[PDB]
């Protein structure tokens, strides 16, 4: 009988897509040994073909949809003004004002998109015409609980655009596309939210909203929010979200520790 | 005459390929209504045909670059533990000492893209056949004081190869097909140095040294660090490195405050 320690170390070892069973009767290091020599061949043949990481590759093929449906890409400071937190109505009655990582006495890693993309819509629409689309893909970060879910260093994308077309119909819409896309399976709930079974994929609005006159915002808009390392662990069927994370203990969801 | 005020903000304005000269006998108000014309115009050009950042263009063009040359992409964590500064030999004497980013207790926003490329060095030569070749870009953080050339946020390119083939030569060839790929104008000069002008592109090493047994690493191995900033930079000409960073005040080097 193998000890929960062992069945730990094998189950880091084990690849979703493989078909061993770790309650059969055989020794832990004919075990060990067998998944070792599977996860060293993945290695290999990422090495020897592709030599793509996830991430970076989703991050890709997410920009080129975007891109290619008139969104322009963005890219903005991740360690912001924390006076942006609290503009955004992150006061201490909510959870959010808890889990930021405060970096000197002014700044912080930004846990949300929306604070920068508020601010390009603002200059923005001075100089483009109307509706205005942009999107923008990068690190977040949230101090969180340990959780099958919850990573505290991840990767958000967030769109929004901004004047005609602002409708509920069309935001489901780009979701709908967007999610057919990349073949991840969805159900949108209604605010909104994108769900996969339990697990939120995206949240999703539509303004106008009270909060947008703080930014200078006053047309009406539509926006979401999606991680990308839930994508992937609902893609590639990871247990646990680490394995789709920027990682020193995975690559491409396959243990660097052999 | 304009004021010292008023040629600050035409500054902002006044992309490197316009032929304007704020010396002329045109009032304040006439010239910034035309570069604001021009400005404008330009967004609406990168809006209505290509939508790409150029800083996530660049990455993703190096990106081909490595892949194609046989380089394993990497994303490994931008939050690292606080001992990887001090294992690369980082004390109080050297000034990279007093330019980390610190967050919580134990971690920081990484200033370098060695301790992670070392780390996966080290696993991955359990696993894939020699040479190993490995590459990563992304965000990169450092305290600076106000300079034309430095970034607090800034874009590394990091790639490094252990094993077999780990001369200098092949080291150089590397450097050199990737500028002249990128179309950057460069001289090495050596512990090697990649230059334009006056401004360090890169600093590229040859191993073994001693620091490597802290990392367990006990091949040859030939690498560099590259700021994408700086190939921007050089490449379209900018006079202030900001033009170039992840920004709420330019894209792709034009003013957004119009
Ligand atoms: N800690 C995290 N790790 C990974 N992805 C995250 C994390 N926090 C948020 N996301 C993703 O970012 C999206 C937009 O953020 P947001 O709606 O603010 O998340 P949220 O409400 O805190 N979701 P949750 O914490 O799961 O209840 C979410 O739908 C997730 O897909
Ligand atoms: N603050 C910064 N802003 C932008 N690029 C930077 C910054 N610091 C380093 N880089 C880039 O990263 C490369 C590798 O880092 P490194 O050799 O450690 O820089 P460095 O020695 O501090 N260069 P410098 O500060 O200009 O004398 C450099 O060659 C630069 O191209
Ligand atoms: N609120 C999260 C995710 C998010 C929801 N949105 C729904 O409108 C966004 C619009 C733009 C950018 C992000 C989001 C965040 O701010 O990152
Ligand atoms: N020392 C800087 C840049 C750098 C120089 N290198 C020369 O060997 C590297 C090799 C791999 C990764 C980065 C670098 C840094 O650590 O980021
Ligand atoms: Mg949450
Ligand atoms: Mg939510
Ligand atoms: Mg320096
Ligand atoms: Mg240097």
Same mark, same amino acid.
């Given at each position: 009988?193998?000890?929960?320690?062992?069945?730990?170390?094998?189950?880091?070892?084990?690849?979703?897509?493989?078909?061993?069973?770790?309650?059969?009767?055989? &020794?832990?290091?004919?075990?060990?040994?067998?998944?070792?020599?599977?996860?060293?061949?993945?290695?290999?043949?990422?090495?020897?073909?592709?030599?793509?990481?996830?991430?970076?590759?989703?991050?890709?093929?997410?920009?080129?949809?975007?891109?290619?449906?008139?969104? =322009?890409?963005?890219?903005?400071?991740?360690?912001?003004?924390?006076?942006?937190?609290? @503009?955004?109505?992150?006061?201490?009655?909510?959870?959010?004002?808890?889990?930021?990582?405060?970096?000197?006495?002014?700044?912080? $890693?930004?846990?949300?998109?929306?604070?920068?993309?508020?601010?390009?819509?603002?200059?923005?629409? @001075?100089?483009? &015409?109307?509706?205005?689309?942009?999107?923008?893909?990068? &690190?977040?970060? @949230?101090?969180?609980?340990?959780?099958?879910?919850?990573?505290?260093?991840?990767?958000?994308?967030?769109?929004?655009?901004?004047?005609?077309?602002?409708? @509920?119909?069309?935001?489901?819409?780009?979701?709908?596309?967007?999610?057919?896309?990349?073949?991840?399976?969805?159900?949108?709930?209604?605010?909104?939210?994108?769900?996969?079974?339990?697990?939120? $994929?995206?949240?999703?609005?539509?303004? &106008?909203?009270?909060?947008?006159?703080?930014?200078?915002?006053?047309?009406?808009?539509?926006?979401?929010?999606?991680?990308?390392?839930? =994508?992937?662990?609902?893609?590639?069927?990871?247990?646990?979200?680490?394995?789709?994370?920027?990682?020193?203990?995975?690559?491409?969801?396959?243990?660097?520790?052999?």
């Amino acid at each position: 009988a193998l000890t929960k320690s062992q069945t730990d170390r094998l189950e880091v070892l084990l690849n979703p897509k493989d078909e061993i069973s770790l309650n059969s009767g055989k &020794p832990f290091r004919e075990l060990e040994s067998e998944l070792l020599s599977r996860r060293k061949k993945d290695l290999q043949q990422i090495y020897a073909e592709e030599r793509e990481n996830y991430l970076g590759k989703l991050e890709r093929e997410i920009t080129r949809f975007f891109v290619d449906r008139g969104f =322009l890409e963005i890219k903005s400071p991740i360690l912001i003004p924390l006076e942006y937190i609290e @503009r955004m109505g992150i006061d201490n009655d909510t959870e959010l004002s808890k889990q930021i990582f405060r970096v000197d006495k002014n700044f912080c $890693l930004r846990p949300m998109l929306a604070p920068n993309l508020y601010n390009y819509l603002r200059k923005l629409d @001075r100089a483009l &015409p109307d509706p205005i689309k942009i999107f923008e893909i990068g &690190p977040c970060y @949230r101090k969180e609980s340990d959780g099958k879910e919850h990573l505290e260093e991840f990767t958000m994308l967030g769109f929004q655009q901004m004047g005609s077309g602002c409708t @509920r119909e069309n935001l489901e819409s780009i979701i709908t596309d967007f999610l057919n896309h990349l073949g991840i399976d969805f159900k949108i709930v209604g605010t909104l939210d994108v769900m996969h079974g339990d697990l939120e $994929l995206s949240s999703a609005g539509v303004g &106008p909203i009270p909060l947008d006159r703080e930014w200078g915002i006053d047309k009406p808009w539509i926006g979401a929010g999606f991680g990308l390392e839930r =994508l992937l662990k609902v893609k590639h069927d990871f247990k646990n979200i680490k394995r789709a994370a920027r990682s020193e203990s995975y690559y491409n969801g396959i243990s660097t520790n052999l």
